[PDB]
Structure 1
Amino acid sequence: WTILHYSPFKAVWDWLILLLVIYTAVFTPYSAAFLCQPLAVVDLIVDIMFIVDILINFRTTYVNANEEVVSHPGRIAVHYFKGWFLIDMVAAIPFDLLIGLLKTARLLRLVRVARKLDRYSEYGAAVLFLLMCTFALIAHWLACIWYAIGNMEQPIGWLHNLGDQIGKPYGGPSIKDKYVTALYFTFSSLTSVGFGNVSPNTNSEKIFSICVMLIGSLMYASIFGNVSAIIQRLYSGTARYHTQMLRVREFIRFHQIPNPLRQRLEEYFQHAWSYTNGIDMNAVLKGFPECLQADICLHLNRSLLQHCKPFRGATKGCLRALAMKFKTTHAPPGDTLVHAGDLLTALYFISRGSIEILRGDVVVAILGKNDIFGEPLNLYARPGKSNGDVRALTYCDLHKIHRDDLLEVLDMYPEFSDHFWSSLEITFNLR
């Protein structure tokens, strides 16, 4: 019989709650200070509907410390009592039985809004809008208090000054002026503008103005703090890029760094920023625990797996392991690399693109579109020179493994090692 707290009707009712909150919180001070009709019935049904809201909250489930979803509305009643229940009941209890300062039930009703502010917030802009709303409500309350003070003082007052400024000698000025000007004065001494139209004359008004500038200074400082925090959070990335640029530039300046080489270094730096954005993929990859890494590495072997004939029959564990042990050597187009006479323990395949091998003005291995090169590991397995020098060409992505790593991972499982060695296809072996 109990409803769940994820019910959409509950969300609609909560939005209606917020609408009532703002409506009463703005109307009641204005009517109590500046000022029959169905509005009295509306005021009564406000508390009636908040009692109904208490009933719904008892009906709808809640989130306990241990149990996220719990039945038995009695438990809802028992935890809610002696707490938010008191606040909501006070907000729902009329005191009809003038004197409007006792109407703190509306004031305590925003405690519920502060309870649900986290649900309200989705990003930082809504926070700025919320502080703007608080700006408006604070201004309204201060203007109403100022209007009350001005009325009380009247038996040279600010009201006389207003009557002298806008033509209405006294009777007195109309109701619209006595509120627009009150808000005008409130904003006058909140943002430290200081107009000359209206200004306190009596001592009580001066003390009130003192409190006003104190509160305004505090909240204005809060606004600057939040704005500065947001701006710095946004521009931290640009500051970071400046930092990498600074280290690159100082390193280049410190070590002579001949001009063609400085040009290549800055080119590679800007290229790396283009896609990495400074953030290395290795760190985030290593942050994932075990099986996540094994699964995600296989997504990179979507270029070599399906094109290599033997690897179709491989087991899933072997594929995931070897996926953890492939490294796609990312290189900008037009790079020279390992030459003849170097080490041959670093085995190399291709993933995409194309490259050239000029072993003394002889063009070989112009392949690279999911292509295969390398050396025989069963018999030869000797370091030294394989074919010769590799030359610069278009987009350079190769496929790295290691001589020791491949053999040790392959010998653990013999049948597919035999399958791979028997079906050892190379598009162009570097010989």
Structure 2
Amino acid sequence: WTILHYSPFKAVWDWLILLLVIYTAVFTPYSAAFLCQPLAVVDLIVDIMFIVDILINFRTTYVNANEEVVSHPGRIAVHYFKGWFLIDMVAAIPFDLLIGLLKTARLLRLVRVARKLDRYSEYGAAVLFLLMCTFALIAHWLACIWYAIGNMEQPIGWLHNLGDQIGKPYGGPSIKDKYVTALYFTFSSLTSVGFGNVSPNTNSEKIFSICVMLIGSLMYASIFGNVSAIIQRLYSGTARYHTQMLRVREFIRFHQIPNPLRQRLEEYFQHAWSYTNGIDMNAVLKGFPECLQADICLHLNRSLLQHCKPFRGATKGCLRALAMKFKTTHAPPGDTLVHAGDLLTALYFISRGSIEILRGDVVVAILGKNDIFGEPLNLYARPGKSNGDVRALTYCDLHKIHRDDLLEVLDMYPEFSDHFWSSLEITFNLR
């Protein structure tokens, strides 16, 4: 009967607790300033729910700084005591015994937001909503303080000016006509607008206005600098792509690069970006060593599994090693590659698309999916010639290995190399 701290139940329970804390924090200052039955009913509901939360905290698991995993109620009690329980215990104190200031301790429940703030941060767009909610909460608190100051100093404040403006001279303005204007002034002072309908006129209201101006200016600047940061990150991924494209284009325009090869270069650029997205796979590859290096290579190592029968006998390490050495060339139909006579160092294979090698207007080796063609290895020791040049009917998304690397790795295995040598099958051997 133990609850996991990362269980999805804790997520919805924390959502409920957060919403309840927001409700309390919003409703208590308004009640304090402007003011059985629903208020005490909701108070009792809140107290019972938070008591249930305090008790259920005694059962959930936790992660220690040293011990990654720790459970059972023997260790939760010592950790939870002598800690954040000081703030939480005073929050859930029900008493009836006006003197309504004692409910301000409920604001301490807002601390519960900060200690789980990390988990809410895994979404990126939620930051904007949380920041706007916090700004509205600060505005609400400042409006509460404004109204409190007005009431306490009015036993020519802003209350009389408000009564004059909207006709209700003194009766007086209603509670609704006294809270909307306070929040209006608070926003007009945090956003630095200053409409002039309501403005401080005494000696304490001006000091409060100065304090609000400073706090709001600081908070506004920092918050919307953060907003600019999140917005500019999302748009700056695309802006980095744009800068790469601009770099390529200015490099082209500086070196003339007439159209016929320039179109190949450009289209190569877009189609390559379609798969790489600017990310260099080698960087994240080198971060993960040994078998973790090849686990990424395992994802492109589904090519020759079903296209070679002796290939199925490979062990984990052998398969890893043969996977790590494959290279991938990307070329949409229209890009021609090396041909006979030149260096036939790399043994060209296929990954996707199709290959239609043309040996002097004769199509040979029509293979499309992870097939085995190429040149002999141990009998050449020389960059000879092939049947004909490569041709591009479909995408030339193909695999490559290297003569030296492949011969070295095939000399590496004592027995796996013998097994592969027992069945050296090639779909089309093009001399």
Q: 1:66 to 1:239 in 2, by over 3 A?
A: same
CA drift of 1:349 comes to 3.0
Q: Is the 8 A contact 2:188 2:194 kept in 1?
A: yes
SS in 1 for 2:26: helix
1:41 match: 41
Whole-Å separation in 2 of the counterparts to 1:164 and 1:13: 49
Q: Which moved more, 1:144-153 or 1:37-46?
A: 37-46
Maintained 8 Å contact 1:340/1:386: yes
Distance in 2 separating the partners of 1:210 and 1:65: 44
TM-score normalised to structure 1 length: 0.87
Superposed displacement of residue 74, structure 1: 5.5
What is the CA-CA distance between 1:110 and the residue it aligns to? 1.3
> Is 1:411–1:417's contact at 8 Å kept on the other side of the alignment?
yes
Say if 1:356 and 1:224 are closer, same or farther in 2 by CA, change over 3 A: same
Give 1:228 deviation, angstroms.
0.5
Q: CA deviation at 1:12?
A: 5.9
The Cα offsets for residues 63-106 of structure 1, whole Å up to 9 and x where unpaired, read as 33333454564543333334312111222235766344454311
Q: Structure 1 residues 272, 93: CA separation in 2 closer, same or farther (over 3 Å shift)?
A: same
> Structure 2 vs 1, CA of residues 93 and 263 (structure 1 numbering), >3 Å: closer, same or farther?
same
For 2:180 and 2:187, locate their aligned partners in 1 and report how far apart those are by CA, in whole Å.
Answer: 11
Q: Please state how far the C-alpha of 1:115 moved relative to its aligned partner.
A: 1.5
Rounded to whole Å, the distance in 1 between the matches of 2:28 and 2:426 is 84
Separation of aligned partners in 1, 2:299 and 2:416: 21
The residue aligned with 2:10 is 10
Show CA shifts across 1:30-78 (max 9, x none).
2222116463465467556545543443344443333345456454333
The CA distance in 1 between the partners of 2:202 and 2:224, in whole Å, is 33
Q: Secondary structure at the match of 1:101?
A: helix
Most deviating of 375-384 and 256-265: 375-384
- Which blocks of at least 5 consecutive residues in structure 2 are unaligned? none
Structure 2 SS opposite 1:357:
strand
- Aligned counterparts, 1:358-373, within 5 A: 358-373=358-373
Q: Provide closer, same or farther for how the CA distance between residues 298 and 207 of structure 1 changes in structure 2, counting only shifts above 3 A.
A: closer
Q: Do the aligned residues in 2 keep the contact of 1:163 with 1:170 (CA within 8 Å)?
A: yes
- Rounded to whole Å, the distance in 1 between the matches of 2:11 and 2:364 is 69
Distance 2:131 2:247 in 1: 40
* Structure 1 residue matching 2:46: 3-state secondary structure: helix
- Greater CA deviation, 373-382 or 227-236? 373-382
Is contact 2:28-2:104 (8 Å) kept? no
Q: For residues 341 and 109 of structure 1, do their structure 2 counterparts lie closer, same or farther at Cα, with a shift above 3 Å needed? A: same
2-side partners of 1:50 and 1:137: how far apart? 21
How far apart in 2 are the matches of 1:413 and 1:185? Answer: 80
Are the structure 2 counterparts of residues 356 and 222 from structure 1 closer, same or farther at C-alpha, using a change threshold of 3 Å? Answer: same
- CA 1:71 to 1:174, structure 2 compared with 1: closer, same or farther past 3 Å? same
Relative to structure 1, the CA distance from residue 198 to residue 430 in structure 2 (aligned partners, 3 Å threshold; closer, same or farther) is same
Q: CA deviation at 1:309?
A: 4.1
CA distance in 2, matches of 1:209, 1:7: 47
User: Offset of 1:298 from its aligned partner?
Assistant: 4.3
- How far is the alpha carbon of 1:251 from its aligned partner? 2.2
CA 182–346 in structure 1, closer or farther in 2 if over 3 Å, else same: closer
Q: Which has the larger radius of gyration?
A: 1
Shift in alpha-carbon separation, 1:225–1:364, aligned structure 2, 3 A? same
Q: Deviations over 1:208-245 (max 9, x none)?
A: 22222222211211222111101111012212112221
- CA apart distance, 1:246: 2.5
Deviation at 1:385, TM superposition (A): 2.2
Task: Decide whether the 8 Å contact of 1:340 with 1:387 is kept in 2.
Answer: yes
Mean CA deviation greater in 414-423 or 281-290: 414-423
What is the CA-CA distance between 1:399 and the residue it aligns to? 3.3
Instruction: Please state how far the C-alpha of 1:11 moved relative to its aligned partner.
Output: 5.7
Change (3 A) 1:98 1:247: same
Work out whether residues 344 and 385 of structure 1, in 8 Å CA contact, stay in contact via their aligned partners in 2. yes
Change (3 A) 1:377 1:68: closer
- Work out whether residues 335 and 393 of structure 1, in 8 Å CA contact, stay in contact via their aligned partners in 2: no
Rate the CA distance shift 1:212–1:369 in 2: closer, same or farther, 3 A: closer
The offset of 1:326, in angstroms, is: 2.6
Judged with a 3 Å threshold, the aligned counterparts in structure 2 of structure 1 residues 275 and 174 are, in CA distance, closer, same or farther, namely same
Q: Deviations over 1:245-278 (max 9, x none)?
A: 1321232233332331222211211221122212
The count of aligned residue pairs is 431
Percent identity among equivalent residues?
A: 100
Cα displacement (A) at 1:166: 1.9
| 1:318-349 alpha-carbon deviations (Å, 9 max, x no partner) | 33322222323332212222223212332223
- 2:349 is paired with a residue whose SS is strand
Q: Is the 8 A contact 1:50 1:88 kept in 2?
A: no
1: CA distance between counterparts of 2:327 and 2:59? 58
Q: Note closer, same or farther for the CA distance 1:344–1:45 as it changes in structure 2 (3 Å cut).
A: closer
Q: How big is the shift at 1:7?
A: 6.8
CA contact (8 A) 2:354 2:395 kept: yes
> Secondary structure of the residue that 2:302 maps to in structure 1?
coil
Q: Relative to structure 1, is the Cα distance of residues 48 and 380 closer, same or farther in structure 2, using a 3 angstrom cutoff?
A: closer
Question: How far apart are 1:5 and its partner, in Å?
Answer: 4.6
In structure 2, C-alpha distance between the alignment counterparts of 1:426 and 1:72, rounded to whole Å: 61
Kindly provide the CA deviation profile for residues 330-369 of structure 1, in whole angstroms up to 9, marking residues without a partner as x: 3221222222321233222334433444455454444445
- CA–CA distance in 2 between the matches of 1:299 and 1:9? 34
Matched-pair contact (CA < 8 Å) for 1:349–1:373: yes
Looking at structure 1, the residues matched to 298 and 8 of structure 2 have their Cα atoms a distance apart, in angstroms, of 41
Change (3 A) 1:258 1:41: closer
More off after superposition, 315-324 vs 148-157: 315-324
> Structure 1 residues 283, 117: CA separation in 2 closer, same or farther (over 3 Å shift)?
closer
TM-score, length-scaled by structure 2:
0.87
Deviates more, 1:30-39 or 1:256-265: 30-39
Contact 1:92–1:105 under 8 Å retained in 2: no
Query: Does 4-13 or 417-426 show the bigger shift?
Result: 4-13
Q: Distance in 1 between matches of 2:8 and 2:244?
A: 49
Aligned-pair CA distance for 1:303: 3.1
Residue range with higher mean Cα deviation, 269-278 or 111-120 = 111-120
Please give the root-mean-square deviation of Cα atoms over the aligned residues, in Å: 3.1
Residue in 2 aligned with 1:391? 391
Determine if contact 2:332/2:392 at 8 Å carries over to the other structure: no
8 Å CA contact 1:304–1:351 kept in 2: the answer is: no
Give the Cα–Cα distance (whole angstroms) in 2 for the partners of residues 157 and 141 of structure 1. 20
Larger CA deviation: 274-283 vs 218-227: 274-283
2:272/2:330 contact within 8 Å kept: no
Q: What is the CA–CA distance in structure 2 between the aligned matches of 1:13 and 1:428, rounded to whole Å? A: 63
Deviates more, 1:231-240 or 1:52-61: 52-61
Provide closer, same or farther for how the CA distance between residues 63 and 170 of structure 1 changes in structure 2, counting only shifts above 3 A.
Answer: same
* Residue aligning to 1:300: 300
- What displacement does 1:147 show? 1.6
Whether the 8 Å contact between 1:353 and 1:369 is mirrored in structure 2 is: yes
User: What is residue 173 of structure 2 aligned with on the other side?
Assistant: 173
